[PDB]
Subunit: 316 residues, 2 copies
């Protein structure tokens, strides 16, 4: 009955309403510490994140999963400061996203396994903060290196029970390619969330993965307007999977952040202008939309509370 957060271990009952795919800052390893003035200042980024997380908490959120890896510039000290000041649980990540530096991309499957295990079992850097989830990312056709990452993630998950979350580049469906590799390693689908699955209308693809026991990440809902399908279209994929009997396979989030340096310079302003609700978009907009579409409150509670707790609880 324990999940590791940036403030230490918590019990399952304390997790509450969870956003399973979020970020405080999307960056690169070392970048926030080397050039904080890219974000105005570290202090300004903290203040923005604390204000935003407090608004999410007032809307009912109790935990977020920050799926920033080392190569996404995860700064666990930043996460800890924001978590404590907003009084919202934050689960930190290990793994490898789409921008590994040489010191990561030259590593073998065995070495990557050891790195993920260090971050889960011992702690991140010198902080003692342990990761509670393993993040992986692929580009449509899984590359040799990305296959090594997925295998190491499966091996680390089998050793520790922590789950795996995935990202696929270019709005492409990658769940079937990912699931093949995970299953060749003996990983249970119930440990894996196929992220950004709301980027497709292919309900056959979604239902087939859910039927195998994968978690389906419908987690970019407010990104609809940026680059196009409406956010309501994406949200109705939640209803569609409920209607086919797969409510227990659904995880919902925003994939939001309070700063971003890994893309074009004022991309944060673009995102904020399109979705001023930020991480509160799920509770303030999506949940009432599903209720008015007739989904029972208990089912919505199961998706936002029970499913994330079952996913995060380490299970061997």
């Amino acid at each position: 009955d324990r999940i590791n957060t940036v403030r230490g271990p918590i019990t399952i009952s304390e997790v509450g309403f969870t956003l399973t795919h979020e970020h405080i800052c999307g960056s690169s390893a070392g970048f926030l510490r080397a050039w904080p003035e890219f974000f105005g200042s570290r202090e300004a980024l903290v203040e923005k994140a604390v204000r935003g997380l407090r608004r999410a908490r007032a809307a009912g959120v109790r935990t977020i999963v920050d799926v920033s890896t080392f190569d996404l510039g995860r700064d666990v000290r930043l996460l800890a400061e924001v978590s404590r000041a907003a009084d919202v649980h934050i689960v930190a990540a290990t793994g490898v996203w789409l921008d590994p530096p040489l010191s990561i991309r030259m590593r073998s499957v065995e070495e990557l396994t050891q790195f993920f295990l260090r971050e889960i079992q011992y702690g991140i850097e010198d902080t003692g903060i342990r990761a509670g989830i393993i993040k992986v990312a692929i580009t449509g056709k899984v590359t040799p290196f990305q296959e090594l990452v997925l295998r190491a993630a499966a091996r680390a998950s089998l050793a520790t029970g922590v789950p795996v979350i995935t990202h696929t580049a270019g709005s492409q469906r990658g769940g079937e390619q990912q699931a093949a590799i995970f299953e060749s390693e003996g990983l249970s689908p119930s440990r894996v969330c196929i992220g950004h699955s709301d980027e497709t209308d292919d309900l056959s693809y979604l239902t087939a993965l859910a039927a195998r026991g994968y978690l389906i990440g419908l987690d970019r809902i407010p990104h609809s307007a940026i680059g196009s399908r409406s956010w309501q279209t994406r949200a109705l994929l939640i209803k569609a999977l409920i209607d086919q009997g797969y409510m227990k396979q659904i995880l919902v989030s925003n994939d939001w952040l309070f700063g971003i340096s890994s893309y074009v310079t004022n991309f944060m302003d673009v995102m904020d202008s399109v979705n001023p609700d930020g991480m509160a978009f799920i509770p303030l907009r999506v949940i009432p939309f599903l209720r008015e579409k007739g989904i029972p409150q208990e089912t919505l509670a199961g998706i936002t509370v029970t499913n994330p707790a079952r996913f995060l609880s380490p299970t061997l």
Copy 2:
């Protein structure tokens, strides 16, 4: 002026002494030493190895090294400061961009990169107050579009601060020529620029032409000869050749060594240490005596190892 910034603060020109102008404590990636120190055994083991290695170089006459590790090479200025203090060897730290920029760097404009370089030179690196004393840049081939931005940002930061620029030249086809054309288009004096890894080629007429234009010529990978069948002596004879051409004042010599490396295959450090057990002491223990045996006088060797680095490192607007 009279002062150069090191990881222990400012020093005067007269304190710089015998300098290795292209070295590394550790070749890594941003954040990596902090996230996975056990790759190197431990942080403590890496420190102990680096302190021993720098004390050995000091006993061979070295007084300063320039650590040309950028952000994206995993530069850890706290590691540099610790090693510098324990070995009593001055270390000059770098800003700039090498060949592995992450997205947060490679998505930036020339103006943004200029501001990043300026913050590392004028304000400090991270939250340490340690200021960079050189700007490092790297190119491949004919210079890629992103690399050209970096070179232009480096020229702008040099022009605003007086600190010099040192380059990693990859490729065998006279890559210094396109670097020079970019630097000159920005208004940068060649005397602020070291075209590095120039010993990778035997093309003496190319090196002489750059030296005659006022560029410093970095003959700085001498011990990498054996790991391409040129020996280290053949590389070292380029030093003699440029002296005989009349360009002693344009030469900078170094090892391009390190005490840990994670940016290539796992135990590459063991391969390197087996080929060159002298480490950073290879230049003073092997190259300087070799040149003396070939008849280069003491005063000329001191000009290359002491005078030229001081003139290069001294911030000169001009």
